């Protein structure tokens, strides 16, 4: 009734596998370790896609069109799968197939969810907030501020405009960090992290 | 016992101060991390009674010392202003050669000297007695983790906050009984349960999702081992931090006092 563990034993075997879905197949069907990267390919289809529903207006509705070969760009490119993970998709975007389709619409939810992201998951207690700035989006920015009161009625992550304008970033994307919840200073943007 | 309730997110305040006016939850529950960057009064006056924490991303099995460290240092005074019930964190593989898992992975329990470094060190920094919760297992590692919990507990005495809804996840995943964590379960005063989900493309594997309300098998387990699981000061932590609506958590609280009366 239950579900052999084949050709391995316990999770750390299959840690090599759990992001990669073309090694999906070297696992035998029944056994539970074909089962297992299936929860956690399934964990990062989810995360890319219930957060940035209109990616698959591109891909199709099972999203193989970008999750598969992402996915394998991303491991020769030794991605992290960090905050910026969403932004590495739209940079692999921009050299696919899909490269003529790529507007506004699907530029800011895929910022909207890298500065999420970061919100969530950085614990470093000395940065407040961060700004993404982008090619794409000249005189503007999406800054992602962690929570510090429990009665704010805002997101915690917004579209700001800047006055004097920012310099567009080297790459597609860059970003800052600020030490609190005030951006007086533009210190310069930095490259995408992996 | 004691029930409580998680509070995770910013947008569920309204309800789960509602809970407490109506008493139905003796405590809250808190992601203590998540709200690091709050004034620590401002929280302890949002609930009118006594809070608990838990820490799910400080990553101490491989943050470095220095991020770490401030952590501790900032959780530490969090800590002084709210003097909570307990302070619990996770045993998780969370990077794998630089990548980070979107699914924690179980850490192969035959690293212990490597834990028992880092959880000794964890625990000197947040200055007080640190509890562990168990993982739901999906491979073979749930067999001998009991007796890891045990060794661990036992050499750095930290406590085990242990997930009655992760030990039945792992019974149905590997065959491993939940009455190994018996005597675990009647030493530590504080716990866990939610309600679990199914992998998508095999409904005998079981995930722990906390979107639904508690299982059939779970609801036994606490209710024929209700002796090992109540003692004095015992705390049990309702976990649902998806599919947050009133009336599904009001009946899985009231199915939890039905379990656990009052004497
Ligand atoms: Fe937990
Ligand atoms: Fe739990
Ligand atoms: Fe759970």
């Known amino acids: 009734s239950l579900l052999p563990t084949a050709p391995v034993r316990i999770d750390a075997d299959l840690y090599d596998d759990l992001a990669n879905p073309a090694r999906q197949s070297l696992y035998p069907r029944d056994s539970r370790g074909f089962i297992r990267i299936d929860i956690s390919l399934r964990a990062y289809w989810h995360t890319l896609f219930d957060t940035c529903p209109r990616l698959l207006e591109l891909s199709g509705p099972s999203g193989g069109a970008i999750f598969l070969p992402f996915m394998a760009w991303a491991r020769e490119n030794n991605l992290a799968f960090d905050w910026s993970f969403f932004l590495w998709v739209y940079v692999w975007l921009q050299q696919s197939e899909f490269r003529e389709r790529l507007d506004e619409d699907q530029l800011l939810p895929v910022m909207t969810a890298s500065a999420t992201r970061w919100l969530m998951i950085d614990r470093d207690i000395d940065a407040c907030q961060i700004v993404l700035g982008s090619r794409s989006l000249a005189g503007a920015a999406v800054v992602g501020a962690k929570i510090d009161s429990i009665h704010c009625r805002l997101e915690q992550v917004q579209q700001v405009a800047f006055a004097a304008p920012l310099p567009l970033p080297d790459g597609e994307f860059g970003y800052f960090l600020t030490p609190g919840f005030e951006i007086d200073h533009f210190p310069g943007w930095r490259p995408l992290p992996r | 016992m004691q029930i409580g309730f998680n509070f995770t997110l910013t947008g569920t305040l309204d309800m789960v101060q509602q809970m407490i006016k109506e008493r139905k939850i003796d405590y809250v529950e808190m992601l203590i991390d998540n709200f690091v960057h709050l004034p620590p009064e401002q929280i302890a006056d949002s609930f009118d009674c006594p809070v608990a924490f838990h820490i799910m ?207």
């Open chain 2, 57 to 263: 991303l400080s990553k101490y099995l491989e943050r470095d010392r220095e991020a770490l460290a401030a952590l501790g240092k900032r959780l530490r005074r969090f800590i002084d202003v709210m003097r909570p019930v307990y302070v619990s964190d996770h045993i998780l593989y969370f990077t794998h050669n630089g990548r980070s898992l979107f699914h924690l992975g179980e850490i192969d329990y035959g690293e212990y000297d490597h834990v028992r470094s880092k959880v000794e060190q964890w625990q000197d920094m947040l200055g007080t007695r640190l509890y562990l919760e168990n993982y739901p297992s999906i491979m073979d590692g749930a067999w001998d983790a009991p007796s890891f919990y045990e060794r661990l507990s036992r050499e750095t005495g930290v406590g085990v906050l242990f997930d009655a809804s992760n030990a039945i996840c792992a019974q149905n995943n590997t065959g491993a009984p939940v009455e190994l964590w018996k005597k675990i379960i009647e030493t530590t005063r504080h716990f866990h349960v939610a309600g679990y989900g199914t992998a998508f493309i095999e409904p005998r594997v079981k995930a722990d999702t906390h979107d639904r309300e508690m299982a059939e098998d779970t609801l036994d387990f606490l209710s024929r081992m209700r002796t090992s699981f109540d003692k004095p000061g015992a705390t049990i932590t309702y976990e649902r931090d998806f599919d947050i609506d009133y009336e599904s958590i009001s009946v899985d609280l009231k199915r939890l006092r039905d379990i656990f009366p009052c004497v």
